[PDB]
From Swiss-Prot, chains A, D:
The chain holds residues 29 to 174 of 277 of the full protein. The modification S-nitrosocysteine is found at C135. This is Caspase-3 subunit p17. The active site is at H93, C135. It comes from the Eukaryota. It comes from Homo sapiens.
Length: 146, 103, 103, 146
């Protein structure tokens, strides 16, 4: 055939892929963390947005740190051969490199490692997107007038 | 030219390649959420995807999200410490190709 | 619609906005350099800029750099610990617009 | 006039801007850091590459941590009104969030803060690019066969 450049990911597989949304609104009193009002609005907005992009959206609410890891591990062990990509959205409290389960923190690294090129072969060479709504520290931006 | 670190017989890619992290805020900063309308970042991300997913490459869509959050939002708080603050999303790309949701 | 955190009378942008960090490697990883030819990242960055700066938007140029480093390079070391290793550059964008070096 | 979109940075100012290259090859014995063979090749490649893009390239070799901060502070205090952007390339040993001067580390944050939207007004709204060749930790990528 003619010249082939391969400058863009192949996104015409049978399925666009999964869009896993972890929506943590209520946290265990034991942690002292406050509820995240308005997060359900985000969760619903995301479900509709990615639905229209043809993703298989799966939502989960108020997951413990153990459940977050179990969910990610299970999903990573699925056969993504017919899927073009993978999307995971995390909605919760957080700190740099950490996302909070309802009973404690989870290293983002632990979550993403399940999808490494060598650990999830059916996603090797395919885009793995992680969208994160959470704090990354305690600095505030005073902004500047323009 | 020739060297010890290029043109391997067995092709391999980094195990960390092809990941994209769309962070709501800059490293070390708080991230803002409106108790009624949702987070500034997700609100903006969905809006830009709905409007440009069938027209722009993903990084360009995320750049529009960066601009929307940076210009349109400013915090409101009875606590002066957290009042009138700004936010800039942070795109972290280890992708190796352009990404279009359409084909 | 109306809210407490949008459409401010006085327009402001985040002080952290409009920054772009082009990292040679992923967070937490070593970065490789050929003692004779230079670092894999800079070698690749210059090559892609020379070839695409008058044709592609900056993020797309950096994505080509990501692919070049990820696919073409693999370390060589007499120390098994550091031998046959890979690297993936990391684009960190807090930019609010597309960037073209030409006009 | 017609419809205006403002989707790309204004890059037609009189000058493209500065491209500051900090090339650290030799470090003080006191630090125990090894020389960075091949870095001069990078420095020269960058000078030529950015020269052809019409940037005002300024190179500096083997700067101490104090000199790095002084250079950045001085440059940030220049009038960038007629410049479209700003570029800084750092070539040295490093760790996460740190770049090494010839006699010790420098927080990348300290360097970039000089260019904050509120601290360098002549660059407000203009792209500030920091290109960094340095380690960000001690992890190694074993890669995966494709």
């Amino acid at each position: 055939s003619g010249i082939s450049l391969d400058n863009s990911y192949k996104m015409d597989y049978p399925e666009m892929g999964l869009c896993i949304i972890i929506n943590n609104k209520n946290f265990h009193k034991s942690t002292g963390m406050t509820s995240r009002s308005g997060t359900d609005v985000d969760a619903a907005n995301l479900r509709e947005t990615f639905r229209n992009l043809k993703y298989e959206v799966r939502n989960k609410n108020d997951l413990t740190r153990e459940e977050i890891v179990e969910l990610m591990r299970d999903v990573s062990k699925e056969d993504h051969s017919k899927r073009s990509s993978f999307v995971c959205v995390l909605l919760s409290h957080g700190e740099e490199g950490i996302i909070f389960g309802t009973n404690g923190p989870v290293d983002l690294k632990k979550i993403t490692n399940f999808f490494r090129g060598d650990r999830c072969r059916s996603l090797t060479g395919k885009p793995k997107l992680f969208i994160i709504q959470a704090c990354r520290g305690t600095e505030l931006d005073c902004g500047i007038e323009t | 030219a020739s060297g010890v670190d290029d043109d391997m017989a067995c092709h391999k890619i980094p195990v960390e390649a092809d990941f994209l992290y769309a962070y709501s805020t800059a490293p070390g900063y708080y991230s803002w959420r409106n108790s009624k309308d949702g987070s500034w970042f997700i609100q903006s991300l969905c809006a830009m995807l709905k409007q440009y997913a069938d027209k722009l490459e993903f990084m360009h869509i995320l750049t529009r999200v960066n601009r929307k959050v940076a210009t349109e939002f400013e915090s409101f708080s009875f606590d002066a410490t957290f009042h009138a603050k700004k936010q800039i999303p942070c795109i972290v790309s280890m992708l190796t190709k352009e990404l279009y949701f359409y084909h």
